[model samples]
Target: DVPVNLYRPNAPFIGKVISNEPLVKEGGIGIVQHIKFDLTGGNLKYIEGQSIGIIPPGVDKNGKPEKLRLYSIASTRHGDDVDDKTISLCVRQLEYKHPESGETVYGVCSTYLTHIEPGSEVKITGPVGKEMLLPDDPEANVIMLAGGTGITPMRTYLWRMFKDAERAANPEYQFKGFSWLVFGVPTTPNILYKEELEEIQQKYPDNFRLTYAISREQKNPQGGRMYIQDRVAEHADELWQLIKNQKTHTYICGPRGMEEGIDAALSAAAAKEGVTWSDYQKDLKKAGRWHVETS
Candidate 1:
């Protein structure tokens, strides 16, 4: 079924915050949260990889109702309890230095979300987006590459693929093929969902592989800070062989600048096999096997 709005934009559903927790280490650089909203008996269902719209309280500078901001859903359809009564979001409070005045500025919606208290009411809408949906094939090999909060959708994909509860819910979707995730973060403490991710890797050692690019803590062969593309380059040969398989699907989500770096790494690898990476990537896109969502 297609994801759409069940509540009207003018009169949005009031979702209660069941939990609002931080995802980073105590000394982590930025604020990233794992917030869950109680949707008990509500029709606010959402699919994995979809996004929900949240309208922060109060009016804008022009006295208009605040506009809604879209945030990626970070949990499975069944939520953390394996019950269809909740929805979750992985949000990073947008903070930056105002270049003109050197003053600190915070994102309106993101800041509101980060500071929101448990049991507080929140306006919500839309279980929208289909571009990042998972394939129906249970045996398809999945490759994921992400950076920072880009880990949001990848978290849902991993959970749907390996979580015991999720696997039990969908008998027809038992995952058997290999899945690899190459994640990039600013520091070791920035690894979101660290424990759960490692737990799955430990449980399904053969079927899953997790690699990190901790930019401030690790280095590439050339002695530069490690990044997702650098990790891709390190395993490009093995990745290239896997990509040659017809059943493999590759996904990329993160900052736009990483795209060029990834393409460069893959291009070098594809060249070694007498194939042009650009041409092959085009074919993959045409075949709907390559998915990307970046900002």
Candidate 2:
């Protein structure tokens, strides 16, 4: 049994924001922060792919309490500090301009998280979700595809597989197979946790491969946007080979419409070898080898 709603909205655990670091370097779209919260003395244990809930402080216009928002956990169960007392989130403060009013507005939960002070306590719940759980086998190959803040879970997955802290904490697991991350973003500065992600690739060049698609800044024909679809198509032949392996798993999170895009690429690739991609994806889904969560 996994740790589901260990803490609920009604009786949620009060956690404090110990750190909130800006993720993007400036000149990016909106504000995104890497926020870490103290779990207090509670045992809010979680696995690599789980989520946690945050209940923003305040009510609606009608005076009801604010609803909770669930964010993908960006740190391993060992936690970012390696003490199991902290958890972190990668959140982009939601912002948009109203055409009629010509005024800017921010999201409730995201604004709360981004503007929250270190000493201020907030209600948090749920070490939730298990659909995107990493394969238990230590030697399984992992292919991670993500865009925007969707990179949250993938970060934890990388840390769990390669970080020294996780290596020391995870006695039963050691990543022995290949792992690849195709992270798509808007620009150079938008690459969150840029250094840490690169450190793994620089150290374990053979075990880990990092490919990035800079959408806006790069020289691409599609409105200055280089879609992950194009990249998947470019590497379809190799990815097709990897998919044929029973131990290989594919995860796509936070990139809206990527499932269709990547599926089209794989579909086209499979046709070359007289195999049907959709049918094979059915088999993959049945075996829990394909995980796609975009939201």
Candidate 3:
């Protein structure tokens, strides 16, 4: 939105993008572009748990500057420190067929990142987001619930944790914990970063866990339309245990309907365990375990 920032940092809490490029373009999401700058110069100041806002330079179809949109950074601190060539982000195109606007409008940031060529210099703000980081204690356990592109941020956090453990230098670096990820998609292929995420599970089988709820009705009871909430219910005991015992914080980002459905299911599950729905809801909110993003 704003012109590129003047100065940059090793890992700036906020910096401006100087370029734009799309690495891998999935069904809808586009990965990183060139983007070079001095500020936030690949600093891991923000932990794997943090998020960043990309102050994308707004532009019109004519390539003229306009406004900016905020997108959570998918790159982890580990990626930042190790790979400084270009920062990565998972952007979903928001397009629709509208009557007035003809082909509905797409997200400013998402479209921009996906379209630009490698050499295009796109301005962007450095990392900016609260570190919803994992706990420091080795015994801590984490579970993530994401659909569509929500895995972007979750991947950042999970990768950072595993990366730190691999390079921990000493036995103290050993990460003792488990991470559960429940990813849902319209179809198997519609799933974003399927290979990348699957590999994470394969490589870190002991610590990282993943399950998919494909909306495809290939085998399920309901016709191909399973939501994340359903998966959360299917894994009720594990989900409840994470919430009741380990004080696990769950991160959710998806369609508004699914978000609320998951919220309701969690509450209902807690109630079945004899916890009052209202009371548990209060505790979850207080503990920040119920992080939900409305569509």
Candidate 4:
């Protein structure tokens, strides 16, 4: 076994790997590693909406640990500044037939991560991403587009919002922002963290919303793959009301195809607001309203 230890990144207050252990399974492919790390050494002061990258150790020509992958921290900042909160990563293990070995070549990081025990230390360097963030005023209208594991960061933010709402019950948080989450999954039963999300919707019905787009095993009855983009497009008028009039910031996260599809749909819809599709796109990028992380 490798002698695992704490890995401090270049920054003093940002990145450090606290623990290494495989905590759960996800997407029937990757391992959901429970990565506990420190934020004391890096300059990053991330909000619920921000993400971090895990700069994994590399693999050489021999198919070893050879790279790093970025994932959104699935924990909100309110939980703890450094040691109080734990970050979750959804890592999909890649498998392919190997002619020479006559067995499948497993994903480097996924395999290595799964091998570590509960008490073992892990090496990871990151917190590099600074884009995508929660609004400061707590009154901004926010829309989230997520698919597959893309739901992680949005869930983190939504959890924080719900917590805030709970705290504001007596005084009424007087929030200036509303949040909408639209997620696309492969199936209904396979919906990730459905129970938690449902509770959030019930808790903050006025300020928060959630919609699911199931892609397979259940057709949309409209005869197409059910995706978040289509659902958002179907509700364009409402979305436009928030974006154009209410001035909402929308964040897009998922695979390449998912982001592209969302961009296309939302851009087309933005045209109705007398703004060119590209103009809306540019604005979203400039304002850090767009985010994506894919393996």
Candidate 5:
């Protein structure tokens, strides 16, 4: 029905996994996957920049069904296959060493998503959230700042804006504006959808620009691990000017940790022009030009 929260936690849709392909290349990083699910005979519609909840099977440490975890929907409203019968996710297995035991703790839903096999049925709920919706204006400029799995929505946007199939599918929409993506990851091979991303860039150099922050392999100007925030700092002046444009929209999506650093870089850049960033960002929020969806 094209509704948010269409499927509640108590009543989630049972979607069958169509494919579970590895996203990270060999020796790149941790486990990540590009998983797709069939959504046939259901009305689990969602727009870009939204998230769907996954309720992992089995019980928790106690005995309850593991609470749902929301994942950013990595497909457009028309779906990745452009058939309106599928949805996809770009997910990383949440693995961290337990502080006390030092044993690796795996995220229930993330691990399930990464390990599940095709034809497996998984609980799905709520195509929720609205913060990261792409601008409908065909000529609106878009600046996407993403880290790791945060590339999900930006990928959807790029597909919609630049992919030939998507461009042909949506006759009502034809993107003619500049789009820039600043993506951060642990390594080069870990760049999700690297081939497709570069393909678009090469095809439309004037319309699309892609930047990467390879933390482990590259160093920032200050001789430290490169990060998306450092890239922002490096080009803050240009970003500031773009942000000032009425037709430009900015999106920051990734770990919640990146928030403060981005704010600092933007703040520093704005200060150079005697502008207060936070105050200005407030107005951008009011104008619906600045969007953030961080975990």
Candidate 6:
């Protein structure tokens, strides 16, 4: 909707890889990377919720040129260095066992990104998506729900709302209302951007609240894996009160499976007040207060 794609398939802009750093700690399960690319010669500009397309080198199974894969933007509009010349992504290399052949398979684009050298160039395109854009209201109460690498856009939102450099860059947007993040990861070490997130929580204790659901190590009241939905359920009354406010906006980004659980949890919460969660969520969507982007 933003008329992005300044560089398309035919003529993609070449962005240089500035850095590719591991996100998960040593004992973490999979390979999640924080990849940054320099957009020096390109006119590629994007907002917090936008995504960029990356075209990996080589041919696909059909022997044609590799197609582009879109990834959520992980940094604020000003980029991590605040130079406005870079873009970053939180990518977890797609690795799984092939069900039929029992062979190991890896995501082409993700693997390429993870193993790319710092000086290597990559074909890049777009700053797309409008649904996940942050609201213009600086006083709006924001609730973010993320799972796994879904933390990408949430990180962008947090940095824009809390980071000192980002706050300095946007003098007009001084967040005054509350901001809550319910992040679900497999383990404590898998919490992406742990230090930065805690720093923000410490600095803005009154304005920011951080909650984590470490599935492997944490347990729910029912002795199940403590997920984002569980955390939502645990604080459903409080969350429902916040959701009832017109100024409160909720965003969910992560694996699609989590959606049903979250909806169920909220449904029960809303039911206590004799309200249907789906109908209320629909109203929220109509008001542009509910945003979701999951894969």
TM-score of each: 0.95, 0.95, 0.76, 0.75, 0.97, 0.97
- The window of 10 residues in a row where model 4 has the poorest summed lDDT is 1-10
Model 4 per-residue lDDT tens digits across residues 84-131: 445555444556777857687876666655454545444454444556
Q: Scored by Cα lDDT, where does model 1 land?
A: 0.90
- Please give the TM-score that candidate 3 achieves against the real structure: 0.76
Ten-residue region with minimum lDDT total, candidate 3: 1-10
| Candidate 1 to native Cα RMSD, angstroms | 1.5
Instruction: Evaluate all candidate structures by whole-model CA lDDT and list the values in order.
Output: 0.90, 0.88, 0.60, 0.61, 0.91, 0.90
Lowest summed lDDT window (length 10), candidate 1: 2-11
Would you give me the overall lDDT of model 3? 0.60
lDDT of 5 by residue, 4-53 (tens): 99899998999999999998999897988999999996789888788999
Compare the candidates by lDDT and give the number of the best one.
5
The all-Cα superposition gives candidate 4 an RMSD in Å to the true structure of 6.0
Worst 10-residue stretch by lDDT in candidate 2? 216-225
Q: How big is the positional error of residue 99 in model 3, measured in Å on the Cα after superposition?
A: 3.6
In the range 215-265, model 2's lDDT, one tens digit per residue, is 886654455578677778778889989989999999889846778888998
How displaced is residue 168 in candidate 6, in Å? 1.1
Residue 96 lDDT, candidate 5, scale 0-100: 89
lDDT against true structure, model 4: 0.61
Worst 10 residues of 6 by lDDT: 1-10
Q: How many pairs of residues collide in model 5? A: 0
Candidate 6 lands at a TM-score of 0.97
lDDT tens per residue, model 1, 1-295: 7667776568788999999999999777899999999997578877877888999978887999889998888999889878888889999999988794568888899999998999999999888887788888988999999999889999998999999999999898899999999999988789999999999999999999999999999989999999999999999888988999999999888878878988888899999979999999999988888888888
Instruction: Report how far off residue 169 is in candidate 4 (Å).
Output: 14
**Model 2 residue 93 lDDT score:** 94
- RMSD values for the candidates in order, in angstroms, are 1.5, 1.6, 5.4, 6.0, 1.2, 1.3
